[PDB]
Enzyme design. Sequence first.
Site, short mmCIF file in Angstrom:
data_model
loop_
_atom_site.label_atom_id
_atom_site.label_comp_id
_atom_site.label_asym_id
_atom_site.label_seq_id
_atom_site.Cartn_x
_atom_site.Cartn_y
_atom_site.Cartn_z
N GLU A 237 0.83 -1.20 0.00
CA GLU A 237 0.00 0.00 0.00
C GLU A 237 0.87 1.26 0.00
OE1 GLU A 237 -3.44 -0.38 2.48
OE2 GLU A 237 -4.43 0.93 1.03
N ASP A 238 1.57 1.42 -1.13
CA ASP A 238 2.40 2.58 -1.43
C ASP A 238 3.55 2.73 -0.44
OD1 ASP A 238 0.61 3.13 -3.55
OD2 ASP A 238 -0.66 4.31 -2.20
N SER A 239 4.29 1.64 -0.27
CA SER A 239 5.50 1.64 0.54
C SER A 239 6.58 0.90 -0.24
CB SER A 239 5.26 0.98 1.90
OG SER A 239 6.45 0.97 2.66
N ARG B 70 -3.52 2.56 -10.68
CA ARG B 70 -2.92 3.82 -11.07
C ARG B 70 -2.67 3.90 -12.57
NH1 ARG B 70 -0.03 4.10 -6.13
NH2 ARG B 70 -1.31 5.30 -4.67
#
Lengths: 46, 297, 78, 115, 152, 261, 48, 67
Positions: free
Chosen positions: B49-51, B221
Amino acid sequence: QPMIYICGECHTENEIKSRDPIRCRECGYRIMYKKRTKRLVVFDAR
Amino acid sequence: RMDTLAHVLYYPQKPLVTTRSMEYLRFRELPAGINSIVAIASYTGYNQEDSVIMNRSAVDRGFFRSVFYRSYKEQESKKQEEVFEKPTRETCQGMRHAIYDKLDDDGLIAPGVRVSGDDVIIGKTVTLPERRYTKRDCSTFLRTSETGIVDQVMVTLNQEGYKFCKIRVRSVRIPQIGDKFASRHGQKGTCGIQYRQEDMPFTCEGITPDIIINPHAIPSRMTIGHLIECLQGKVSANKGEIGDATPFNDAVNVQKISNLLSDYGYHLRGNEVLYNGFTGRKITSQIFIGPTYYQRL
Amino acid sequence: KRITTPYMTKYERARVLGTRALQIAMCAPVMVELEGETDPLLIAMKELKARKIPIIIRRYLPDGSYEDWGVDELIISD
Amino acid sequence: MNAPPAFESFLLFEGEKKITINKDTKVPNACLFTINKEDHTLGNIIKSQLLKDPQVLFAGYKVPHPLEHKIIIRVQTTPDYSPQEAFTNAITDLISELSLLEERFRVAIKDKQEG
Amino acid sequence: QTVGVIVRLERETFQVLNMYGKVVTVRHQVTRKKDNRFAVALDSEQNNIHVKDIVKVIDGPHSGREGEIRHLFRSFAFLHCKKLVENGGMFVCKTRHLVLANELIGQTVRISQGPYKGYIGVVKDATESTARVELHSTCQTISVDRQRLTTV
Amino acid sequence: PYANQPTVRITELTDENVKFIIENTDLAVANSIRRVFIAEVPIIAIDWVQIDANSSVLHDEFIAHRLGLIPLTSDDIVDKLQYSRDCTCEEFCPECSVEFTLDVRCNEDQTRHVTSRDLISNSPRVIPVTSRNEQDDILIVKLRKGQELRLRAYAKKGFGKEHAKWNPTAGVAFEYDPDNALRHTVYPKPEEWPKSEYSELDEDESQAPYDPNGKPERFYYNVESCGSLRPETIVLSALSGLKKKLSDLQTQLSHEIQSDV
Amino acid sequence: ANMTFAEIVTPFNIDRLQELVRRGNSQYPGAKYIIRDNGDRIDLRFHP
Amino acid sequence: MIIPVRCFTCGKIVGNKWEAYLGLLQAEYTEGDALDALGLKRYCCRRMLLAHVDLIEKLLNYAPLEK
RNA sequence: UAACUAGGGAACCCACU
Ligand SMILES: [Zn+2]
Ligand SMILES: [Zn+2]
Ligand SMILES: [Zn+2]
């Protein structure tokens, strides 16, 4: 008591006291820099 | 420059995959970022999650290491007289519990001195208008949560002919957990964890990724330019050239980049067989890995 | 005669456990035996499971009257 | 600021033990081996060497958290055997295997250098 | 070197009864000292007394009266009696004549022992055993035992 | 219930890499050997820099970080050297460290390249790898006229688990099952996957037939050294270090069993 | 190490809280203040 | 600003190869041939030299404050 | 023979979720 500043233009070792203006004694440039400290500077090489 | 809030990267690299407009933006000569070997994989769940997962051994070698500069300025004024001097407990009022011995005889700290939060860097005393205390402490300290090394001390006159000093504090910033990193395609993310080189997954050639990003950052995205830039970076790094990613260029498509990559002994879609860093067993899924351009935010 | 619910609410659970834990931390005599437990929260939990907490809950009705319920008189959720 | 020093991954601070023995209660002949300042490098070889033992009914290791530096090895054996001697025999077999590998690598070094 | 308590507020002077039994007259510009509210004093029975304690006078020039403790000294105690009309009830009695009714700070050091051996730092804070060393090379300040520190 | 009987075949030995095959051992042993290659082989690297003068455009932390990454010849000296934390001296001593001195003053109109030739050792055998008596020298900083760099550096013993400057290897290439007979990786389209260097199949084949009884053996290695140690010394010290870790764990486990029982 | 919880001293936790006070505010697993029964506050940052 | 001592990914020494890379580039080598002549085989080591910008030569154009 | 704190407001701009 004896403090040394380095002129930003001509790079001259400047002995000046306190409360006298920041003024290079032989080129008149009004910006001077402190010399590097004499304390122990030790870095690990990481 | 004694700029307030200056950040400088140690090893900025020009992108391997560039547009032709970057020649005129002068991004080649003042680049902001590093071309990093990046695998898009689910590894231990610390990049979810966006890490991102960073290579600790890369960071030890100066990867994305940066230096933070903060400048402190202070004037002495004549109204009540303020003077740059080293305060003493026997003659000054309001002195904090800080090491005032780091100051010199002019009330200013010298370059090369290590400083921490609430350390005096400029000693300033203002005289009382009316015994035990004749001067009041008005010294300037660092920010409470900021450390560093004094980088440069500049002393001059201001416009109104008063003594004026500027002190630049140098703080070296190692990339750590929580530092924000972004691709050139809107794919930002903090560092979730750092693994050493032996813990990172590796190709058959021993190449471990510098950054591992989650596969789930891609599909909602739809940053396909990220994957194409990664593929073109693999082709460019193997070929020994700088890839052209000018947008509306029909001479470059995914199939041509894939055939070029296949010419260099790699799988044409940029996938590689990775092995687990902990067990040595090769991963069942072949991981998309290659050089792509990240920025340290 | 008491007309409120015979079950003991989670808000009553929270406040009774907090009050009993504060009392035990202030050296109130424990109504149950201790098997080496030290945290007053866990002691209050063990006291509540044994229905031994010496606290009366005064439930206030909207018309102004109240109803006094013992902790032992009420049904514990767990 | 909150960065742990780099030696804490491999240096025992004053007070802790390198390896502790804990009996697993829910099944017989099972022990939990909590080893400090070690990682997958040692846990994996111990786990696989225990898996080679036919008297070992369970052999697994894990790192509970990668930010800390302990591994937990769980060994369950047959009732005519104990997890402690299973662990001892696994370490002994790994040591002997590495000794044989080292001397054969040295022999191969001399063979390659002398052609 | 001498403490005192003011007995009367005047326009330009302070009337202060010190440990003499004599009231002095001094100017405004006395200084202020932090009172030791947790100080311990000993009476003739070697019993512990503190602030706001009623003590009886059984010896001295003014034996027979009773007072309350306001401030303490090494061998003196300040007394108050609301029925006593001289100097607003302030008086002083001796403690034994009653009965109850670092240099390391700011110094550059070298950690010469332990895991941080060789690191150069400046002592921010220190005790008899441990010291807070601000490491020159890192952003950390660490607690080091003072037996592992060498002043450089 | 007993140990493996591993065999070694070395296919290429060079001053910059060793390329060998280990057969008849387990995957966990091979992977731990690779992990000790990267992380747990001790070498000498600089870990203590005292800057006396630095007029260069690069600040002191930058220069120290670059000095740490300069590899030093560590063969047959890293075994004699103790760890700095384990040695009983106050400052550094010859029994646990190697002292380096650098003193460069630029007085010419040309740019002065401070390289690894300017790193002057107090030990004849712990020297920078590029200073060995072909290849150029590792550039530390470039100096213009008026700039100088005077420093005293101490180089101590450590392994790559602490910091990557003590990693002796450049690339540890590791392979097993090059024809995917075990199906440990599953190619969606095996035709477009290039053959491994150690593949033993023809051009018409894409991967080996599935072997249900197979295990991973015949592990392929290519240990490229950074020059700090000889690659054969890297492998030998890795085997010795893993042996030492296992022996130490045996010692502590024997003490714990003796104390518990 | 910055945020604190006020723990009431009982005979059940007198030794643990005593060694927490002895460690002080400099070490992380320590304490910042002692609150006496009369509300008097003892600062452990400045060593008493 | 200056060439890194080691490749970030693997740790191969590349700090001794920047001047040789520039000398090969002015000897009319292509960048790929220059990388191949320096022994940089992995693309991780290749983009350390391919993507490097030498800011230090621009920093040296300014006179130092002390001399 | 350790005498122990922090400081205002009003506007704008930028960034972040
Ligand atoms: Zn001048
Ligand atoms: Zn020594
Ligand atoms: Zn590389």
